[PDB]
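Technical annex B. To support the medicinal chemistry partners, we prepared a structural model of the target in complex with chloride ion, based solely on the information shown next.
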Amino acid sequence: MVTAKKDENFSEWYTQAIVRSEMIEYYDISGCYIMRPWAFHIWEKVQRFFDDEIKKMGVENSYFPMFVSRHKLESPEVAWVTHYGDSPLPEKIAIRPTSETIMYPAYAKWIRSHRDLPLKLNQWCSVVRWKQPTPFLRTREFLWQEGHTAHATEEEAWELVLDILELYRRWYEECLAVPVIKGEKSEGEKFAGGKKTTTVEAFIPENGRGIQAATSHLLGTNFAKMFEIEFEDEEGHKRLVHQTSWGCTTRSLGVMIMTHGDDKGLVIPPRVASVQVVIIPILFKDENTGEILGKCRELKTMLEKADIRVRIDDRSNYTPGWKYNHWEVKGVPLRLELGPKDLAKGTARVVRRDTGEAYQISWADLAPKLLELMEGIQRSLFEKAKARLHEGIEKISTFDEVMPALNRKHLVLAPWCEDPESEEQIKKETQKLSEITGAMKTLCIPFDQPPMPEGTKCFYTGKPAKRWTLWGRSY
Amino acid sequence: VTAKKDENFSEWYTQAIVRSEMIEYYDISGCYIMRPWAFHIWEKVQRFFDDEIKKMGVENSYFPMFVSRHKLEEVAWVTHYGDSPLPEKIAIRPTSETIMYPAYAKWIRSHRDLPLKLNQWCSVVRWEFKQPTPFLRTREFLWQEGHTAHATEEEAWELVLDILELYRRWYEECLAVPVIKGEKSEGEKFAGGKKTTTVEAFIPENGRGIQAATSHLLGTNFAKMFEIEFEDEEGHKRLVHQTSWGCTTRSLGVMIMTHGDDKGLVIPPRVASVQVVIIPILFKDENTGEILGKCRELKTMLEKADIRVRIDDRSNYTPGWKYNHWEVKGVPLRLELGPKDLAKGTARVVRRDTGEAYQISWADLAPKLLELMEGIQRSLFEKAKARLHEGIEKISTFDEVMPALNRKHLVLAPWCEDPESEEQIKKETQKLSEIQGAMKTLCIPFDQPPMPEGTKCFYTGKPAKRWTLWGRSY
Ligand code: PRO
Ligand code: PRO
Ligand SMILES: [Cl-]
Ligand SMILES: [Cl-]
Ligand SMILES: [Cl-]
C-alpha cells in the first residue's frame, strides 16, 4: 500500500508508487535503476506498438556497437572506458550517448545512388549520458529506440520527421493516455548540429513542470557534409542526403505513472496493461471451493476469446483482501471478484481501478461489458489528464504576468520574437526572481498557433512577436 | 564468393558473410554492425524463444550495465564523464550474476516468493578475444540470459531441461540446424554449478564441435554465496535452487556454416528477411510499366499469404547480376518474370538450395511457394542431419582416436568421467597433432547407447561410466 499523498509530498509519493508496485529496485550507482518485470511489460507493449508501426513505414531494425572511438565522436555527458584492470587502454573509447557518429560512416559507405534511398534504420538499445536523477525520467543509462533515415530530398525527410512525430503522439496519447503538445524546439534547445527539431511535450501539474516526451529531428544535410554521405542523382550529379533522427525512451513510463497515479498507487491504462482483468476467487472455509475455481477458469476462457488479457490470482498463500490491495497498488484496471454468493446469482462483481465504481454483471454479458468498461477507463484517463493540461497553461502578454503564473505551477504561452539571446536572458532573470532549478525555458513553439494580432509585441523584449511560444519550468 | 567452402573454410566464411551484406566493419576492433539482413534472423528467433518462455511464466527485465567498486569487493573501468573524473570509478559488468543475485536475496523471503523466473535480452562485451570474426569471436554480442530460483532441486532441474528443449527447437525448427543434447564434463561445466547441459552442433568442414547453448542447474551454491534464503512452510530457512541459461548470436554463425555452399549463404525460409525475391527481366530506360505492374500485383498476392517478398527493380544491374546478388545473400526463392513469362501467364521460380526450377502459373503461385518453402526448410534440416551422423565415429580404444580426428570426425567413446584423464587426453591429442588441435569432450549425450557390462574407458582402462562425445572444437 501507498501512504504518501500525491498532492502533499510528490517525490515521496513517486518513490513509494514505483517501489511498492514492484516496478523499480534502487541501485548503488546513482541514477541507475533495476527495471523489474511489472515495468518491463509496459515497455514491451509500447515497443511492440511502435515497432509494428515503423515496420509499416519500411523501417528495418539493426544493431550497431555500443562503443564509439574518440575521433568519430569528435561531450560532457559521455562515459569513457579508460582502463582494463589496472592497465590503461591504448586509446580510450566511449559508451554511446547516441548513435549518429556510430552509424553515419556506415551510411557514407552504403549510399552511392538515388537507388539506395531511402535508407531507414532503427535500433532498440540502451545508452548512457552522465543533474540529480529520477527513475524513468532522468536516469544515467536508459532504454530507447533510435531511428535514422536518409532521403534524396528535404521534403521527403521532413515528411518522415512529421510521420514519426505523429507516431510519438499516438504512443503517449493512444497507448499511455498522456496528452502531449506538438511543436518545434527553439534554436537553443534543438539537437546540436541538426537543422530543425520537433517534439511532443508533456506537463506535470503537481510540480508544474514541462517535460520533453520524445523528439524527431530534421538533420538536413549537416551530418551528410560532415560524414560525406552523398548519392548520385538521376541526372548524374552528386548530392548530399537529407537525414532524420528520432528517439523515444523509458521516460514515457514515468510520465504515465505521474499522470495517472493516485494515492493508492499506479493506474495502468488498459491498452498497455499486461493484465487487464484480474480474477480473484473468494475462498473462505470450504464454501464450494472447486466450483469457484472452475467457474473462474471458464470466465477466463470466455474473456480471452474477446482478446482480453486475464490473470486468475488463485494463489493459496495469500488472502483475498491482500490480493485486492496487491493488484490495486499495481494498477490493474479491472478487478473481478467471484464468491459463493456470486456463483449463486450467475453474476460477478467488477471494480474499476480508476474510480472504484463497482458493477454486478451477469456472466453472459461479461465480455462486451468489460470491453466497454476498458474503453471507458482509457478514454477517461485521457480526458481528465487533458483537462489538467488545459488548466495548466496561462496565455500572457507581458513579462509581469510570468512569475505569478509560474508560482501557480503553470506553463505560460506568450508571444515571442524567437531571438536566441532573449531565451538566455529569460532563463537567468526567472531564476533570479524565483530565488526571491527555478528557471523558465522554452518547452516548444507549438504547431497549433493562435492568431497573432498585428502589432503584438514580444512579451520580454518589446520587439514584434513572431510566434506563440510555450515556456515553463522544466525537467 | 571465390573461396570454396570445403577447401578454405575460414576464407569462405569471411567472403560469404561480407558479400551477403549481413554485417559491416567498424573502427573498433572486434566489433561488427548487424545489418537488417542478419538482424532480422535475430528478431525471428528472439520472438520465438520469448513467446515460449513467456508461456512458462518467465518475465523480462533490465539490469544496469555498471557495477560499483564497492560491490565487486579484469573489468572495464569507466573513470570519466566528459573531461570530468567520476568521484569513484564504476565498471562494466563482468557478470549479470553479480548484479542480479543480491537483488534476488532481497526479493526472496518466503516460499510464497518462489519460483522467481527472470530473463534479459541484452548485449555483452568480452574484452579478450584472440582474433575476431563475425558471430563467433566478437568483442560485443547479443544474447538472452535467464535466471530462476526454486524451492526444490526437482523443479529447477525440470526447468533446466524445458529450456534446453526450447534451445533445440530454436536451432532445429528455426535455423534447421541439428543439435545433440548432453551434459558437460566436470572440467567444462559452469564453475560453481551442479550440472551444465548443452546443445552441441558440428561443423564438417573443419570437423569441429561447437556449443550452441547452455542451461545450468546451479543448485544452491550461489544461494549460499549471496544468502538467497527463504523460509519454508514450516518456518525453516532453506537455500533456493537456481538455474541459468543463455544463448547468443553465435547461433547465426552456426546457421551460416551449416547451410552455406560454394555460391554463398542459404537462409532457411523460416527466418529469412526476404523469402521470395521477384526479379523483373528489364534493362535500363526501357520500363513501360507492364513488367513492374505485374510484379507488384504478384507481390501483393504473395504477401496476402504472409510471404515476405521483395522486388529488385534497380535499373543499373543486369538480371544475371541480380540473380548472383540474391543467391549470395541466400534468399530461399527467386521469381523471374520477363516478357515471355508475361506473355504466357507464368513465372519461373528457382530454389536456392538445389537450383531446381519450376514454371508456375500465376494462379498456383502462392500455394506452390508455401509448399516449396516448407520443402526447402525440411530439406535443409535433413541433409544437415545426415552430415551430422556421418561425422560421428563410435570407437572403443584410444588407437581409433587419431584416425577419426584426421577424418575430421567426432568420436563417441566409453569414458570413466575422471577429469584428470580429460586433461591428459587434451595434452596427448595435442602433442600427437603437433608431431603430425586438441580433442576435448563436447558433451555426454542424453541419448546413451547401451553400455555392455564391464566395458572399459577408451583411454584409462578403468570401468567406463558413459558414452562421451569428443572432438576438436571452437
Ligand atoms: O538523441 C537524440 O535526441 C537523437 C534522436 C535519437 C537518436 N539521436
Ligand atoms: O555464461 C553462461 O553460460 C550463463 C548463461 C546465463 C548467464 N551465464
Ligand atoms: Cl523544413
Ligand atoms: Cl491465470
Ligand atoms: Cl590441427
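Notes passed to the chemistry partners:
The pocket of proline (ligand 2) is lined by residues B 145, 214, 244-246 (CB under 6 Å).
Chain B has three domains: 1-268, 269-374, 392-473.
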